[PDB]
């Protein structure tokens, strides 16, 4: 061993660089990569693992993004532009980054940060999720990964070998592999992994947690505005295939066989599967996505929610829950009447109509069940409450209520739930204020963002982000986020019976019970009944 | 013409008695016939009109009541046996009675009262159906009718001309007819007749109102906690044959025909077939009484909905309302978990059971949409939300979202309409505070009972009576509650669009907008269009 830079791995020696961090200084480990580029008769294959190297791989600067679509929909606008690839794309993209403090630590908590982007899009490399400031203030070593999105990550043709589906959920379990595998050589301890993402991340999260070969490879989980069994994360096989084969369809492929369908989109360069992706969806709707994780038998061998009540999943501790206002983006760039540069007061007709878009498998009982359970017939023309209303029945239905069934469901056999609601707006916050507490505005608190001066967020932001890094990380450490004998108020833990939560803000901490019940048995408990029955 | 007390009719000469009423006196003439007595082989039969009589009626003292079930729940308590017999019953109770001012005037403004009681039960003579308070203080005619109930008044084998049904509203008719071709010698103004009813009275109103051969009778309506179109106030003609056939059954009758069915209970006493007369209902049910009107194709030229749709109706004023707690005396009868000497708080089970009798054409899914929007999820043990969650249900869907019905079809096409919310509870009421503001404790301030110091109102509710007769008569007399001119707060039209109310109590009046809509657009409009889908 030479210097504090250099790390011997399994797979060869890697060069970090040293990274200035709040007038101090850390190592990281940019672009490692851990399994082979899946390239051309690869597209679509699970990944393989990463052959070892001679030599030492420079690890200065990150690698590149997966390939993705990218949002256009406000040029130059970084609310919107925060979230895209910033730096190229490629297939060759399965590669994780490693932020070590200095002095290298010997044996220490590991976090894996696992990004968002409902499938189809996300990057490990965002402003947002440097992961420097995390690990040099509380001491971790953190980690965050990438895996393949949109029908590279995703496409499903199950019964061939070739596109099985769910390899993007593969590629995020080499990572986690590799990292069981050899970050004790970065001062990580192995046996304390806490796994974290946000939204679809926060799903993967979920869905490691099921999936047998998954579990074993970390300690414990946080899920951010997500959960395994959210309406738009998974598809049943024929439904995977329906989508491979009209994917196919808008590319004039030969579709008599599985082998043909795939030829076909092997020779395709990336860009025509993105520009076409959209067109596979089977409804008008918004907070779907076109290539998500099938239910397959294999990664998962039943449904998810027999798995989820014979308690066929990883027993450990979770830390997890959502933002006021999940819905709001999905509004904003899909249902009629909701723009950027207005208050967004929606009239009856657009209310009805987002419903519509909002729960697209509805028939006409269910879509007014919606309705009457979400209008104030004292004031059905109030444009502010109808516009909120629909951001309730959005985030309700797609983030809040699958969340809520997912906790009280794993709090039954698992061993410690913390569960929180995170609603501070930001003050510096450029979307408009009608969306309030946005989808992903939680990730800068949780990533510490707030400390940078020059980002110009306030000192009451700043000690929130510093009291929500300090919960993150003391649960990564032991499954449990309150300091053993402090003087601070204690988030209590999440029982079956007495469903304790708390707030998240710049606010004292305040408990309450029972989150969104009101709601959550609607959408949980009533709507699906109602829609099984006509 | 000889004296005040005597007064000549087309039927005949009638003899009244001078009686005391507030330090004054005024005339009263009671138990004039106005049919002929529906006994033996008239029994189930529809009305014929009373034949002339020589010499003088004396009508100083109360007919008979109509045979009718007798409430026995609470022996001596006067709460209940307020509303029973205080007559002796018999066949023969087709009367009414008059009260008119002193001196007796010209062309007065007549009211006319009918009855409630499920149309089960009911007498035109109970105390708190006393009309001299009325009529002396505001100078109108007041009659009240009296009309067959029960088996005797709906017994119904559509096709027969022996029991045709409904023979107890064309009682109501008949008294109606003898009060417009006769009230003119008593003084009263026969083009200014209002009809006014409570609860089944209420609904039969609505009836007359909607009824072609009723319409001409009178001018204006008055409908108290009652609407034609209640679940519980008809039934399809298959549906009282099937009872009556049951009630048959009940009596060991011969049922090979129509004629051997009714010829078996005509033999039968009144009480026979008054003791078994529960026994024929479908569901074990509360709010649901045996024989009542039926759609006909006669009486009700189609389904009370198309009349209601297509305007046809008689087109005139009406002024009608509700009580707050119009569901507490058919649970503390039927429900079990309510009893009388308790608080009656509510469990779980009993919630769920009360449910199932209140709603008893429901599925399952019927009951859960029920529930849910009934129950709060925060807090679904406290006993006391489950109680009055309860009394609510019962309430809307029986009273409150049928009038509320009632009142936005009707006000399409008629000529004004007046809404009331009696909220007050009677700080005498002998009945415990959880039931609330009852079913039927309005017309004790209808009728002017606070007035007289004994009963042991406060001076407040003395003031609520007065302002209430003064609103009752002052409607009848010109189609307006409120005084032309006067300085009083107005209570304004109710209209399509606006959908004002006002509360009638103690206190200041308050007008409000869309009485119980959240609640009635789930009565009125998606629980039958749910239970229509499955
Ligand atoms: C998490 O798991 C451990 C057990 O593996 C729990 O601690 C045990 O609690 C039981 C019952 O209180 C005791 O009988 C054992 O002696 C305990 N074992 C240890 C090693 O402490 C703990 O209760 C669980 N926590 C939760 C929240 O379920
Ligand atoms: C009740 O009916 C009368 C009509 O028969 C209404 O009074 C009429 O109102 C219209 C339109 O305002 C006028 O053109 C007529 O000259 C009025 N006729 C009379 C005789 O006044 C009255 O508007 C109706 N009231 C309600 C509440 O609908
Ligand atoms: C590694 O490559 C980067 C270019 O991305 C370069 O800036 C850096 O100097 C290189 N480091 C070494 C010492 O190889
Ligand atoms: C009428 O009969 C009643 C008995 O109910 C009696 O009290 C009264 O004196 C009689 N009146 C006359 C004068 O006939
Ligand atoms: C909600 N944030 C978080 C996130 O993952 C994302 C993806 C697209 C647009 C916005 C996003
Ligand atoms: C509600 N009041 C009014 C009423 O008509 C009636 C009948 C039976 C028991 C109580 C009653």
């Keep these: 061993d030479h210097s ?17 961090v709040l007038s101090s200084h850390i190592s990281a480990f940019l672009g490692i990569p851990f399994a082979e580029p899946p390239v051309g008769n690869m597209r679509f294959r699970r990944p393989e693992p990463k052959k070892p190297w001679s030599g030492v791989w420079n690890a200065s600067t990150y690698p590149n993004n997966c390939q993705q679509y990218v949002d256009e929909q406000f040029p130059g606008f970084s609310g919107s532009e925060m979230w895209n690839p910033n730096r190229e794309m490629s297939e060759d993209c399965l590669y ?72 993007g959920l593969l590629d995020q379990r080499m990572a986690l592999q590799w990292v069981h595998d050899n970050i004790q050589f970065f001062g990580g301890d192995p046996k304390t992994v806490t796994i974290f993402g946000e939204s679809a991340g926060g799903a993967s999260v979920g869905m490691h947690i099921l999936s047998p070969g998954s579990r074993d490879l970390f300690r414990r989980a946080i899920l951010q505005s997500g959960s395994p069994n959210c309406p738009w994360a998974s598809v049943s096989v024929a439904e995977g295939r329906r989508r491979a084969v009209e994917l196919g369809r808008n590319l004039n492929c030969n579709l008599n066989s599985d082998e043909e369908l795939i030829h076909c989109l092997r020779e395709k360069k990336p860009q025509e599967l993105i520009d076409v992706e959209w067109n596979v969806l089977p409804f008008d709707s918004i907070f779907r996505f076109s290539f998500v994780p099938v239910i397959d038998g294999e990664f998962f061998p039943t449904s998810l929610e027999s798995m989820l009540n014979s308690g066929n999943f ?114 510096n ?106």
């Design 96 to 167: 994780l980054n490693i932020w070590v403090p200095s002095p290298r630590p010997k044996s220490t908590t590991v976090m894996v940060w696992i990004y968002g982007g409902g499938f189809y899009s996300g990057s490990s490399t965002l402003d947002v999720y440097n992961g420097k400031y995390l690990a040099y203030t509380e001491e971790v070593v953190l980690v965050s990964l990438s895996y393949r999105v949109g029908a590279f990550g995703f496409l499903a043709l199950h019964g061939s070998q070739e596109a099985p589906g769910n390899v």
């Design 314 to 427: 990883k027993k450990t501790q979770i830390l997890l829950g959502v933002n006021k206002d999940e819905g709001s983006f999905f509004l904003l760039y899909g249902a009629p009447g909701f723009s950027k540069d207005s208050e967004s007061k929606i009239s009856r007709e657009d209310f009805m109509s987002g419903v519509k878009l909002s729960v697209p498998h509805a028939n006409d009982l269910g879509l007014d069940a919606v309705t009457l359970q979400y209008t104030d017939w004292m004031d059905d023309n109030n444009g502010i409450k109808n516009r909120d209303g629909l951001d309730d029945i959005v985030g309700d239905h797609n983030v809040i209520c699958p969340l809520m069934h997912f906790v009280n469901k794993y709090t039954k056999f698992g061993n410690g739930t913390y569960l929180y609601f995170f609603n501070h707006r930001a003050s």
């Design 4 to 20: 504090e830079l250099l790390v011997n791995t399994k797979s060869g020696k890697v060069m970090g660089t040293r990274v200035p």
């Design 429 to 534: 916050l450029v979307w408009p204020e009608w969306m309030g507490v946005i989808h992903g505005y939680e990730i800068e608190f949780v990533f510490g963002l707030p400390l940078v001066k020059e980002l110009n967020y306030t000192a009451e932001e700043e000690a929130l982000s510093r009291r929500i890094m300090h919960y993150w990380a003391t649960f990564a450490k032991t499954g449990n986020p309150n300091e053993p004998h402090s003087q601070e108020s204690k988030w209590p833990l999440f029982t079956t019976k007495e469903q304790k939560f708390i707030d998240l803000n710049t606010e004292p901490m305040k408990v309450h019970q029972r989150l969104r019940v009101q709601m959550c048995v609607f959408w949980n408990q009533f709507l699906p009944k109602l829609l099984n029955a006509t």
